[PDB]
Amino acid sequence: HHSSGLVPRGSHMEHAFTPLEPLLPTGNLKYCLVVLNQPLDARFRHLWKKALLRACADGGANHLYDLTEGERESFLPEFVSGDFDSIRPEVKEYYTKKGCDLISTPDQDHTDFTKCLQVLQRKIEEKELQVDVIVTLGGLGGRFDQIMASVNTLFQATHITPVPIIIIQKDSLIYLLQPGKHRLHVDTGMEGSWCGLIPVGQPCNQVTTTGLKWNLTNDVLGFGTLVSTSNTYDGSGLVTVETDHPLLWTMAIKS
Amino acid sequence: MEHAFTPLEPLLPTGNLKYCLVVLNQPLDARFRHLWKKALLRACADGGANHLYDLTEGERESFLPEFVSGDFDSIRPEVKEYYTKKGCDLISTPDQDHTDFTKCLQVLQRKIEEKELQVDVIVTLGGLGGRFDQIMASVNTLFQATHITPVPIIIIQKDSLIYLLQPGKHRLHVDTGMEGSWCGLIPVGQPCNQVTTTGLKWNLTNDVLGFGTLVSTSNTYDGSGLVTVETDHPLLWTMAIKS
Ligand SMILES: Cc1ncc(C[n+]2cccc(CCOP(=O)(O)OP(=O)(O)O)c2C)c(N)n1
Ligand SMILES: Cc1ncc(C[n+]2cccc(CCOP(=O)(O)OP(=O)(O)O)c2C)c(N)n1
Numbered sequence A: 001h002h003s004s005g006l007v008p009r010g011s012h013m014e015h016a017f018t019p020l021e022p023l024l025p026t027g028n029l030k031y032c033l034v035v036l037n038q039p040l041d042a043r044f045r046h047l048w049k050k051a052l053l054r055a056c057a058d059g060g061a062n063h064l065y066d067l068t069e070g071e072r073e074s075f076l077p078e079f080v081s082g083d084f085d086s087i088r089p090e091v092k093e094y095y096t097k098k099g100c101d102l103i104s105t106p107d108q109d110h111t112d113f114t115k116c117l118q119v120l121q122r123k124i125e126e127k128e129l130q131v132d133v134i135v136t137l138g139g140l141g142g143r144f145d146q147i148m149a150s151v152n153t154l155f156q157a158t159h160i161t162p163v164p165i166i167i168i169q170k171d172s173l174i175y176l177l178q179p180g181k182h183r184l185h186v187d188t189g190m191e192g193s194w195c196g197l198i199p200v201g202q203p204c205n206q207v208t209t210t211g212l213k214w215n216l217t218n219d220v221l222g223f224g225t226l227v228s229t230s231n232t233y234d235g236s237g238l239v240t241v242e243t244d245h246p247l248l249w250t251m252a253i254k255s
Numbered sequence B: 001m002e003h004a005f006t007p008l009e010p011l012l013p014t015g016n017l018k019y020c021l022v023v024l025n026q027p028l029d030a031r032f033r034h035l036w037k038k039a040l041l042r043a044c045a046d047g048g049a050n051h052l053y054d055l056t057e058g059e060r061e062s063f064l065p066e067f068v069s070g071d072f073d074s075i076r077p078e079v080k081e082y083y084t085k086k087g088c089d090l091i092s093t094p095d096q097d098h099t100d101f102t103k104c105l106q107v108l109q110r111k112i113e114e115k116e117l118q119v120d121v122i123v124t125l126g127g128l129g130g131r132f133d134q135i136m137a138s139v140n141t142l143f144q145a146t147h148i149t150p151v152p153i154i155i156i157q158k159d160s161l162i163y164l165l166q167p168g169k170h171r172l173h174v175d176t177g178m179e180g181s182w183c184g185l186i187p188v189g190q191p192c193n194q195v196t197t198t199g200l201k202w203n204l205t206n207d208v209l210g211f212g213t214l215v216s217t218s219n220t221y222d223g224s225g226l227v228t229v230e231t232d233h234p235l236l237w238t239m240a241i242k243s
């Protein structure tokens, strides 16, 4: 203001995110990996390799243990948290003898996924390291109530860690967009054909987007009113979203 | 004043329950056969026909839909042919603002009034797995369904069932013996600020259910065989189906 010479004016911060980047072979993101109790998709090995930290939520360990025979010492979690109402005795044993940190989380008011994030967040600050994103595998298939629980974890996550969290399983990815403006880069080449915007918690009364086939212009998104599913990209390679309330972004993963 | 309902009833080998069956584009669970046999009317939404067709090979004439609606961008030509040849009514629904599931219910409701048929419930198979944006669409269809037909609609796939509870009081009978161990109340859409329940391990007493505040998942039954729910806004009921 009071300075002289050219001076940038106008400007509002925007959240610039690239969803499926962790799925890119090369690149150097810096992310943590969380394995939930669900069948592991083949992309897990590559994701594990470059992850800064890996962990498993209860049953998640069973799935990891069973899909890494002959090379399990190459897939040793930094820690396995949960309540152990899912991990098999022998699996709990193996990881404990190899040095894995087994953390018990009894709380019956919260899922192991949520509790696992709490442990992860703590290990993050406690190890003075920071991540650009937390990649969660599984949680979108199987039991319906659990799928919803996963979505609800993304809500609580805002109070657990400042690091963005994405959930991936089979051909889907979800990411909760907090109120404000977002710039999502969907030009990694790993993108599928569909995408969508789900009002999960409450109606989003003012949504505006760009880069979609069916864009919103200060529109209302709400169950029973209008939910964007089976939407697609305009080809620009960029999607911007502005929402007044938490809005769930979902997109397809190639192949 | 209230609606007495029994969710997993169609799954019972016994009964006179009059219901219609809708097959969505997802792999059919084994329960399919029995459900089809006693259905008053069967239909398929686009791709649903492919899964029906590939499942009933060798005996497709015993499993002929009464109509297949959609937009035919999933139904394989050979499949589309077969059913047209056997007399199945193929109805096109191009509307790209509505899923083939919602549009299928529209066709169904029409057929119901049209045939002066009386149905207790509409059983939908599939729609809870696969593409995430798909599962949500299914949930969204249940919201729109309230303006498409007065007949209760349930969706089932694998081990899950969902049913949208409209504002008011509900009495759910969960003593068919087909019930699984878990159940839940999901406030999709909007926060339900006044929820009161009975028959659950974790009941609610004029409590608030909303994402980020409190969502009831992994809940269970108290063994009474009855669950009652009073809600101020649409509340999604979900429950497990035995092994
Ligand atoms: C209100 C209410 N509701 C319900 C409940 C229950 N819950 C919740 C959350 C969480 C939990 C735990 C579990 O998780 P897991 O680990 O996953 O197990 P599963 O069954 O799922 O397998 C619970 C119990 C409460 N609390 N509240
Ligand atoms: C806003 C908005 N967003 C999105 C869109 C799109 N959409 C929606 C709904 C529905 C549809 C159709 C789809 O269904 P399907 O056919 O079943 O799927 P696929 O896979 O077959 O393709 C759409 C497109 C709008 N419109 N708006």
Ligand SMILES: Nc1ncnc2c1ncn2[C@@H]1O[C@H](COP(=O)(O)O)[C@@H](O)[C@H]1O
Residues within 6 Å of the ligand: A036, A037, A038, A057, A058, A059, A060, A082, A083, A085, A086, A111, A112, A113, A114, A138, A139, A140, A141, A142, A143, A144, A146, A147, A149, A150
């Ligand atoms: N059927 C399922 N569908 C989706 N996520 C699941 C399912 N079962 C378990 N999970 C997730 O995996 C985490 C730990 O698994 P578990 O303790 O074995 O139930 C939970 O906190 C959930 O977030």
Ligand SMILES: [Mg+2]
Residues within 6 Å of the ligand: A058, A059, A082, A083, A084, A085, A086, A112
């Ligand atoms: Mg557990």
Ligand SMILES: [Mg+2]
Residues within 6 Å of the ligand: B046, B047, B070, B071, B072, B073, B074, B100
């Ligand atoms: Mg279609």
